[PDB]
Design an enzyme around this catalytic site. Structure first.
Site, mmCIF file in Angstrom:
data_model
loop_
_atom_site.group_PDB
_atom_site.id
_atom_site.type_symbol
_atom_site.label_atom_id
_atom_site.label_comp_id
_atom_site.label_asym_id
_atom_site.label_seq_id
_atom_site.Cartn_x
_atom_site.Cartn_y
_atom_site.Cartn_z
ATOM 1 N N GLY A 137 3.106 5.862 9.407
ATOM 2 C CA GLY A 137 4.659 5.876 8.933
ATOM 3 C C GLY A 137 5.408 4.698 9.356
ATOM 4 O O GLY A 137 6.617 4.497 8.803
ATOM 5 N N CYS B 153 4.476 1.613 9.053
ATOM 6 C CA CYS B 153 4.503 0.508 8.101
ATOM 7 C C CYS B 153 5.734 -0.242 7.434
ATOM 8 O O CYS B 153 6.795 0.818 7.150
ATOM 9 C CB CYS B 153 3.422 0.646 7.136
ATOM 10 S SG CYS B 153 1.497 0.312 7.652
ATOM 11 N N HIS C 298 0.815 -1.140 0.122
ATOM 12 C CA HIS C 298 0.070 -0.008 -0.066
ATOM 13 C C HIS C 298 0.784 1.219 -0.055
ATOM 14 O O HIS C 298 0.148 2.284 -0.059
ATOM 15 C CB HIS C 298 -0.960 0.060 1.004
ATOM 16 C CG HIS C 298 -0.273 0.117 2.350
ATOM 17 N ND1 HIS C 298 -0.310 -0.977 3.424
ATOM 18 C CD2 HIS C 298 0.031 1.220 3.328
ATOM 19 C CE1 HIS C 298 0.269 -0.349 4.692
ATOM 20 N NE2 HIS C 298 0.481 0.781 4.237
HETATM 21 C C1 UED Z 1 1.234 1.813 7.785
HETATM 22 O O1 UED Z 1 2.361 2.917 8.273
HETATM 23 C C2 UED Z 1 -0.082 2.075 8.480
HETATM 24 C C3 UED Z 1 0.061 1.573 10.206
HETATM 25 C C4 UED Z 1 -0.969 2.150 11.042
HETATM 26 C C5 UED Z 1 -0.984 3.717 11.310
HETATM 27 C C6 UED Z 1 -1.691 3.860 12.731
HETATM 28 N N1 UED Z 1 -1.208 2.467 13.216
HETATM 29 C C7 UED Z 1 -0.814 1.474 12.390
HETATM 30 O O2 UED Z 1 -0.719 0.196 12.575
HETATM 31 N N2 UED Z 1 -0.943 1.341 7.907
HETATM 32 C C8 UED Z 1 -2.188 2.122 7.315
HETATM 33 O O3 UED Z 1 -2.264 3.275 7.649
HETATM 34 C C9 UED Z 1 -3.332 0.923 6.635
HETATM 35 C C10 UED Z 1 -3.281 1.068 5.368
HETATM 36 C C11 UED Z 1 -4.243 0.166 4.604
HETATM 37 C C12 UED Z 1 -4.080 0.421 3.096
HETATM 38 C C13 UED Z 1 -4.150 -1.536 5.177
HETATM 39 N N3 UED Z 1 -4.439 1.359 7.382
HETATM 40 C C14 UED Z 1 -4.735 1.460 8.733
HETATM 41 O O4 UED Z 1 -3.890 0.872 9.595
HETATM 42 O O5 UED Z 1 -5.893 1.840 8.928
HETATM 43 C C15 UED Z 1 -6.512 1.893 10.310
HETATM 44 C C16 UED Z 1 -5.812 3.157 11.018
HETATM 45 C C17 UED Z 1 -5.229 4.003 10.298
HETATM 46 C C18 UED Z 1 -4.856 5.165 11.000
HETATM 47 C C19 UED Z 1 -4.778 5.313 12.322
HETATM 48 C C20 UED Z 1 -5.377 4.286 13.077
HETATM 49 C C21 UED Z 1 -5.911 3.127 12.432
#
Ligand code: UED
Ligand code: UED
Lengths: 305, 305
Positions: free
Chosen positions: A143, A145, A41
C-alpha cells in the site's frame, strides 16, 4: 552542533498526497495542478503482477474506474493516460495546495526525502540515497506505492522518485515522475538482480568532514595518499572510484576544515584497512555514505525553506 | 519491508512556527491559538547568559519589544508572561493553521520528532529519544532554539519538547511546553553535568524484534535467561534494568514473532558479551535504542495520520 540524518519538512508534499483505487487495488497518488500521478500497476489484479500486459489491461479501464480521494473529498477524473510506468489522471480541479515544483531525474549518489504514505495519508518521513546500483533502502509496506521522494530548494519542491516495488534483497525500486525506472528494473513480480552495492565514496568523505566539524577527530592521521593509490583501496572494498570532480565538490569542506581532501582519503584508507577498532564516528560504528557534500554543508550552516 | 528511523510528517507543526526577536536576539516560537511560546532567554544579551536574572531582565521589556513574524506577516503582541523557562506572548490573532494539539511531558525512553527551525523557517525533521539522563542527541545550531519536538496520534499533535541549549558533551537539553526543563539543567551558560548515558534496554529489544520481522535473524540463539540474570549483564554495560512492565510492553512483538521476551534477552546478552563480530543488524553495527515498542509496531503496520 550535532549531525543527524535529516529529512526535509514534508508539509508541502503532504498537501499533494491522494488515494487512488482501481478495482480492488489502492495506492497513493501525487496531485499537482489538475493531474494525479500514480504507479500504473494500480490497474493490476494479484493475478496480473507476474506478467502484466499494461496496454491490454488499461484499455478495459475508463475515467470513472479511477477513484481518486483527497482526504475525504472525491476528485472527478476527466482523462487518463500512461507515460512509461506511471499513469496521469486528469482531474477537473487544480490542487489548491500545489507548491512550486519541478520533476527531476536524480543521479546515483544523491539524496532525497521520502514521505511514506498509505491510503493517501502520510505516515512518516526519512532520508534516502539513490544508491549506485539504482536501489534505495527504505521502509515500504503493501500500500505504500505512489509514495514519493523529493528535495526542497527554498520554496521549490523537486520531485525525483515514486515508489513501485521491493526487490528480493529487501531494497526498493521505483521511477522518476516521468515513469522511467531508476536502474534496470521493470514493474512485474519477477526476481530481479540489483547488482553490487557500491559505497558512495565522496559521501563517506563528506561525512568524515562532518565528523571533524562536530568534534570527532580520532581517525585523523599523519598520512596522505594519491587518487590512484586511494582508488586501489576503493576497488578492493567496492567503493566508487574517486575522481577530481569529487575532490572539487569537497573543496568547500576541505577549505572550511583546513584538511586536504587527499589527507582525508588517507584517513579513510586506514579505516577501510583497519576497521574502527570498536570506536564510533558521529554515533555510527560503520562508514556512512548517504550524506552528500551539500547535505553536510546544508546541515552545518542552517539552510531553511 | 525495511526499517528506518522515521519522523512524523511535519506539516501540521510547520504551520505553527514563527520568528521571535527581542533586541538583538532572534529565535523560534510556536504559535497555537492566540499564544506564541518561546524560550525565555530570547530576552538575554550575550553578556547575560552567564548568570541571567530573568525576572529583572523581563521587567525592562514591553509587549512592543517582542517582534513576532509568521512568514512575512507581523503579529501584534498584546500581552506577555513568563512560565518557568518559557515566555507566552499573547497575540491578537489566532493561528488559522492551529492543529488539534496537547502539551505532554514525555517519559525518558520515549521518542519524538524534532522540526529543526531557524528564523521561524523549518530546515529539517528527524527522530530523537528522550534519553534516560534527560538529554537528546540532535542537530542544533545557533538560532535553532524554540524548535519543538512532538508526536502525532491520528490528527492530534502532542508537543513534548522545546529546544534551549547544548551541553559540553554535544548533547541537547530543553523543556516541555510548560517551560520545565527535562533533567536537572538550567538556562544559563555554565558547564552542566549530564550524567551516565544509560542505554534504553526495552528499546534495543524492540529493535531486535524489528530485525527478526524484517529478516535479520543471525543473532537468535539456543539460549534463554531470567530477568535477574539478564539484569546482572545490563548493569555491567550501563543498560537500564529490565522490568516486568517492559516484558509486558514487548508482549505484542513477542506474540507476533513467536519469540519469548526472555529468549530475546538471551540474544541481547550474547551480543553485549561478544559484540557483533563485524556483522550488522538492520544496517547498523551497534545496538540501536531509539525505537520504542510502539515505534516498531507503528512502522511495521503502516499507521497513518
Ligand atoms: C506497492 O504498494 C508495492 C510496494 C511493495 C510492498 C512491499 N514492499 C514494497 O516496496 N509494490 C508491489 O507490490 C509490486 C508490484 C509489481 C507489479 C511491481 N511488487 C512487489 O513489490 O513485489 C515484491 C514484494 C511484494 C510484496 C511484499 C514483498 C515484496
Ligand atoms: C538557542 O538557539 C541556543 C541553542 C544552541 C546553539 C548551539 N547548539 C545549541 O543547542 N541556546 C543557547 O545559546 C544557550 C542559551 C543559554 C542562556 C541557555 N546556550 C548554550 O547552548 O550554550 C552552549 C553552547 C552555545 C553555543 C554553541 C555551543 C554550545
Amino acid at each position: 552542533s550535532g549531525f543527524r540524518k535529516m529529512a526535509f519538512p514534508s508539509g508541502k508534499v503532504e498537501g499533494c498526497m491522494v488515494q487512488v483505487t482501481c478495482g480492488t487495488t489502492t495506492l497513493n497518488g501525487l496531485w499537482l495542478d489538475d493531474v494525479v500521478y500514480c504507479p500504473r500497476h494500480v490497474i493490476c489484479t494479484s493475478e496480473d503482477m507476474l506478467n502484466p500486459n499494461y496496454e491490454d489491461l488499461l484499455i478495459r479501464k475508463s475515467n470513472h474506474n479511477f477513484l481518486v480521494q483527497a482526504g475525504n473529498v472525491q476528485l472527478r477524473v476527466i482523462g487518463h493516460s500512461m507515460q512509461n510506468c506511471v499513469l496521469k489522471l486528469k482531474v477537473d480541479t487544480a490542487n489548491p495546495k500545489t507548491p512550486k515544483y519541478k520533476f527531476v531525474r536524480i543521479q546515483p549518489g544523491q539524496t532525497f526525502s521520502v514521505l511514506a504514505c498509505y491510503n493517501g495519508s502520510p505516515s512518516g518521513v526519512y532520508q534516502c540515497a539513490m544508491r549506485p546500483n539504482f536501489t534505495i533502502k527504505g521502509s515500504f509496506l503493501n500500500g505504500s506505492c505512489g509514495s514519493v521522494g523529493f528535495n526542497i530548494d527554498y520554496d521549490c519542491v523537486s520531485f525525483c522518485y515514486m515508489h513501485h516495488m521491493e526487490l528480493p534483497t529487501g531494497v526498493h525500486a521505483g521511477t522518476d515522475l516521468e515513469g522511467n525506472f531508476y536502474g534496470p528494473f521493470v514493474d512485474r513480480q519477477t526476481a530481479q538482480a540489483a547488482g553490487t552495492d557500491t559505497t558512495i565514496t565522496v559521501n563517506v568523505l563528506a561525512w568524515l568532514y562532518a565528523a571533524v566539524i562536530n568534534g570527532d577527530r580520532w581517525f585523523l592521521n599523519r598520512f596522505t595518499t594519491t587518487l590512484n593509490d586511494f582508488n586501489l583501496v576503493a576497488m578492493k572494498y567496492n567503493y566508487e572510484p574517486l575522481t577530481q570532480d569529487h575532490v572539487d565538490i569537497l573543496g568547500p569542506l576541505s577549505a572550511q576544515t583546513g584538511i586536504a581532501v587527499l589527507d582525508m582519503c588517507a584517513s579513510l584508507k586506514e579505516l577501510l584497512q583497519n576497521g574502527m577498532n570498536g570506536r564510533t564516528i558521529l554515533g555510527s560504528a560503520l562508514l556512512e555514505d548517504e550524506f552528500t557534500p551539500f547535505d553536510v554543508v546544508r546541515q552545518c550552516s542552517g539552510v531553511t525553506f
